[PDB]
Design a binder for this molecule. Structure first.
Ligand SMILES: *[C@@H]1O[C@H](CO)[C@@H](O)[C@H](O)[C@H]1NC(C)=O
Lengths: 48, 48
């Protein structure tokens, strides 16, 4: 996994292109995606 | 003059309060900002 650097990605069927970083948003344990007010994917969880 | 000064000074004071509490006066400006940020959503949803 690479951070702070524009990359392409696929996470467990989530497909998208973006700039991954570390975050502070406490995701729900049983959750998977974060999202945003326009519904566009705003975060993820690294299953490994 | 004096009386006219006080009536003016005090009358300024209300404008703080009238703004400080009641949130309706700015509806206009508050309306423009919405409808712009409104349409963008309604614009972006279309991508779904
Ligand atoms: C991934 O592997 C490491 C060591 O191989 C392990 O400690 C870690 O728990 C693994 N991740 C998960 C989600 O099990």
């Amino acid at each position: 996994l690479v951070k702070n650097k524009c990359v392409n990605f696929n996470f467990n069927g989530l497909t998208g292109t973006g700039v991954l970083t570390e975050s502070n948003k406490k995701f729900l344990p049983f959750q998977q995606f974060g999202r945003d007010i326009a519904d566009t994917t705003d975060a993820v969880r690294d299953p490994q | 003059q004096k009386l006219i000064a006080n009536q003016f000074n005090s009358a300024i004071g209300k404008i703080q309060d009238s703004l400080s509490s009641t949130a309706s006066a700015l509806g206009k400006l508050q309306d423009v900002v919405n409808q712009n940020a409104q349409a963008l959503n309604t614009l972006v949803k279309q991508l779904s």
